[PDB]
Amino acid sequence: AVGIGAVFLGFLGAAGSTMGAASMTLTVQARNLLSGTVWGIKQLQARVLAVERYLRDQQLLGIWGCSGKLICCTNVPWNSSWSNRNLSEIWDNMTWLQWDKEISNYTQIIYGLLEESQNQQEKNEQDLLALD
């Protein structure tokens, strides 16, 4: 029939698959990220650590150009000193966990580059809107 349990995977379902098939379904890891007298305080400090580290990822996402769009292009070019890999491989050769080792030095340079490339784009949108 229509609707089967084969290609409709679950949480962390495509965790070994290639990036071109992991970016097909990103919402399944997205929605299970917030919901799911001293052992009540083990409940409190487990809850306010979940809603805190969710908001922290929604803030670093927020101050770039991506409010809730969940996939978004940007303006910074890709300097080959970061990864030096071909484009035609890294969407069907590697997998995401193999990528996260391959780049982990160069984050906080990209995260610093993204904020300035947004705030430069933000006021330049205003200067276009101000003259007209």
Note the Cα 118 to chain centre separation in Å.
Answer: 16
Point out which residues bind a copy of itself (CB under 8 A).
23-27, 30-31, 34-35, 37-38, 40-41, 44-45, 47-48, 51-52, 54-56, 59-60, 62-63, 67-71, 73, 115-116, 119, 122-123, 126, 129
Nearer to other proteins, 26 or 33 (CB): 33
Count how many Cα atoms sit within 13 Å of the Cα of residue 6 in the half-sphere of its side chain: 4
Nearer to ligand NAG, 64 or 102 (CB): 102
Q: Cα angle at 12 between 63 and 14, to 5 degrees?
A: 100
Say which residues have a Cβ less than 8 Å from residue 11's Cβ, sequence separation at least 6: 28, 29, 32
Tell me which of other proteins, ligand NAG, a copy of itself, none is bound by residue 102, counting a contact when its beta carbon lies within the kind-specific cut-off of 5 to 8 angstroms: ligand NAG
Nearer to ligand NAG, 88 or 105 (CB): 105
Distance between CA atoms of 112 and 68, rounded to whole angstroms? 20
Distance between CA atoms of 118 and 17, rounded to whole angstroms? 32
User: Should residue 16 be labelled a site residue for other proteins when binding is judged by CB under 8 A?
Assistant: no
User: Should residue 46 be labelled a site residue for other proteins when binding is judged by CB under 8 A?
Assistant: yes
- Site residues (vs ligand NAG, CB under 6 A): 102, 105
